[PDB]
Every structure is written in structure tokens, then in C-alpha cells.
């Protein structure tokens, strides 16, 4: 019961930018906030599970499945091995997240995925990122998300299709207090608490040639491919 997969944004280009920005919030002061929420999920019930995924560039390693002193010393040594194409990939990590939930749901459970996104969104994976949301919506898997600086437009649609929460933190070093407040309770205890409501949804699409975010465009009538301001003929078939 209550399996919680955390997908951390381990983008080594954005985290190195803040490591020299002297903003007093590095990666090592953020993975330990995942480790405390990882440890605090293993206390609210006896039979609770955990899985942490790290989103590198061109790689996405599982962290925790390779008492809590053997559950935190693995995530410490794996960040020490993974952190030693200038945009991160997120849909490859949520694809492994839906694969791990589906296997652990075969050995029995309500599950949910918490994404801690840090860098800006990559619109080049919108055709794949939207597939893993409907694959998660058909199994009632919540996709919660907390963002650090910039509102990811793709990630707000993940929390409203599935039914999760979207929360923009205003402060970097108070990350753990938001994580323990709105993402620590499960789906059933969420109905009995007050959470901040979603404030905005970023509904756009992408062209099939430029993949730009369009608000007014042209769709085909048989292919349903949305296009930019040309509309000569159906390009696909």
C-alpha cells in the first residue's frame, strides 16, 4: 500500500549554475530534502514502499532499489556515482516510473508520483510526455509536482489530468516544509485537509514541424496534427 515514486530533476547544468550563483541552495541541500521525505514516507505506515529516480542528461538511474540506514546510504552513493543535450529529459523518467509501479502492482495498492522539477521545460518531448500522462490516468496514478523557479507548462497538465497537486515554492531552503505539508498525505487523507488550489493551467500544443507552443493554429481533420500558420495541405499523409 501507498507506493510513492519520487522523480528528482538531477540536471547537472542547472544545478551547477546555482552552485556558482551562491543562492545558498545546492543539490546536496535538495537530495537530502528528498531523503527526509523518503524516510518520512516509510514511517506513516508499516507496509509502505519507496522508489527514487534521478533525471540526468541522456540517463535516468533508479536510486533506492539497487532500516533507513541502508535506505539512505544507497541514495547517497548513487548521486556520488551518477553526477560524476543541454536540456534535461523528464518523460524518460516518468516512463520508468509507470513501469516500476505496474510491476509492483502485479505482486499484490494505490500509487503516486512526485516530481521535483528544477530546470525549464523541454517542448521537444511533448509527443512522448503526453503519452505517459494518459497511461498514468488509466491506473489512477497521481502525478504530484513541485517546481522551484519557473512554471513548467507541461507539468501543470500532468497534475490536472491525473488529479494531483501543483505547487510552486517561493523559497528554496524551505523546500522540506512544503514537501511535508502537501505531498506527505496520501490520496485518501488528501480529502480531509486544506491544500492550495491550482491557480493556472498552461494548455497549448506543439506544431508537428517546429514544436513551438501555439495558442491559435490549424488542425487537420483526419490526422488531428495541429500546425502553425501555414495550412497548405496535410503534411503527414
Amino acid at each position: 500500500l501507498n507506493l510513492l515514486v519520487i522523480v528528482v530533476d538531477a540536471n547537472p547544468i542547472w544545478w551547477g549554475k546555482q552552485a556558482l550563483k551562491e543562492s545558498q541552495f545546492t543539490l546536496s541541500k535538495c537530495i537530502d530534502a528528498v531523503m527526509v521525505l523518503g524516510n518520512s514516507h516509510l514511517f506513516m505506515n508499516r507496509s509502505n514502499k519507496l522508489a527514487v529516480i534521478a533525471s540526468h542528461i541522456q540517463e535516468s538511474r533508479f536510486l533506492y532499489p539497487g532500516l533507513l540506514t541502508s535506505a539512505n546510504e544507497v541514495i547517497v552513493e548513487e548521486i556520488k556515482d551518477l553526477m560524476t543535450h543541454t536540456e534535461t529529459l523528464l518523460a524518460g523518467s516518468l516512463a520508468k516510473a509507470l513501469c516500476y509501479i505496474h510491476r509492483m502492482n502485479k505482486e499484490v495498492m494505490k500509487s503516486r508520483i512526485l516530481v521535483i522539477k528544477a530546470a525549464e521545460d523541454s517542448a521537444l518531448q511533448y509527443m512522448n510526455f503526453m503519452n505517459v500522462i494518459f497511461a498514468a490516468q488509466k491506473q489512477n496514478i497521481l502525478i504530484d509536482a513541485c517546481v522551484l523557479d519557473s512554471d513548467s507548462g507541461l507539468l501543470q497538465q500532468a497534475c490536472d489530468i491525473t488529479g494531483g497537486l501543483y505547487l510552486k515554492v517561493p523559497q528554496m531552503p524551505s523546500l522540506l516544509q512544503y514537501l511535508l505539508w502537501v505531498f506527505l498525505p496520501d490520496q485518501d487523507q488528501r480529502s480531509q485537509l486544506i491544500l492550495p488550489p491550482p491557480v493556472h493551467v498552461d494548455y497549448r500544443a506543439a506544431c508537428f514541424c517546429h514544436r513551438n507552443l501555439i495558442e491559435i493554429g490549424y488542425v487537420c481533420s483526419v490526422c488531428l496534427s495541429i500546425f502553425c500558420n501555414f495550412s497548405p495541405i496535410c503534411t503527414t499523409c
Binding site: 552552485a19 556558482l20 537530502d32 524551505s174 522540506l176 492550495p196
Partner: protein
């Protein structure tokens, strides 16, 4: 491509000194101020007031707000229809000229109406309608700039 090769360098050396847990994860000051953030009196302005005040009890103003819907709505459906058909004919050009003055006449007949109704308390929001006439305003500016580019 000069800052990518060093920020990737700076994050590799950072991941040797690692895992402080006791006091380096949170502070007592920042976590206490976060309680004020998620309280119903903090960054929850939608939580403190759920229903719009509408400058009075919403019976008489919402009658005029419904009349302000029909006064701008059924005039803009004549504006956007002739704007839709590009046509490049004199009949559509004269209709665009005829709708130009009326849309300008729709401004002063709604601004004075918002100067009469919202002077008793000035409590409700009336500018939500105003961008719909402002969208009718700048669409005449960009078409005249396009017709100057077309000719």
C-alpha cells in the same frame, strides 16, 4: 558554449562532500514562516473570500451586468464577422468603416455607464468587460497597419 563546460565541472566536485542531515536540512526560522504561508490568511486570498462582492447585493448590478453582456456581446458579433471575411471589397471596407465609429461609440457609452454605476461604491470589477472592447480596439489598429502593408 563557455558556461556549460564549467557548470558541469562545478557540479562534479560538489558531489564528494555530502549528506548532512541534522540541522542542514531546515531551519527553525524559515519553517515557522512557512506556516504563515499556507495558513488561510497567508497566500490564500482566494480562500479568505469565495464570492465576488459585486458592489451591492448581486441582484440589481447583475441585472445591469447582464445588460452589459448583451450591449457589448451582440455588437461584437457584428464586428468580428466582417473582420473574419477579408473580402478586399468596398462593401466590406465601408462596413468596416461603419463599424469603426460605432465601436468607438460603444466605448463612451460603456465608460460613462461604468462611471455612473461604479461611483456609488466603486467596489466591483468592471474592467473584465473592458479588454473585450480593447480587443476590438487594437484589432482595428493592426488591420490598418496590415492594409498599409498590403497596399
Amino acid at each position: 558554449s563557455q558556461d556549460i563546460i564549467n557548470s558541469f565541472q562545478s557540479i562534479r566536485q560538489e558531489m564528494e562532500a555530502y549528506t548532512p542531515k541534522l540541522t542542514q536540512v531546515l531551519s527553525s526560522s524559515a519553517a515557522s514562516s512557512t506556516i504563515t504561508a499556507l495558513s488561510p490568511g497567508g497566500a490564500l486570498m482566494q480562500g479568505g473570500t469565495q464570492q465576488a462582492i459585486n458592489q451591492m447585493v448581486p441582484n440589481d448590478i447583475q441585472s445591469e451586468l447582464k445588460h452589459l453582456y448583451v450591449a457589448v456581446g451582440e455588437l461584437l458579433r457584428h464586428f468580428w464577422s466582417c473582420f473574419p471575411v477579408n473580402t478586399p471589397f468596398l462593401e466590406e471596407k465601408v462596413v468596416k468603416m461603419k463599424s469603426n465609429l460605432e465601436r468607438f461609440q460603444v466605448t463612451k457609452l460603456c465608460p460613462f455607464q461604468e462611471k455612473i454605476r461604479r461611483q456609488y461604491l466603486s467596489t466591483n470589477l468592471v474592467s473584465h468587460i473592458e479588454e473585450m472592447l480593447q480587443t476590438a480596439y487594437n484589432k482595428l489598429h493592426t488591420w490598418q497597419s496590415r492594409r498599409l502593408m498590403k497596399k
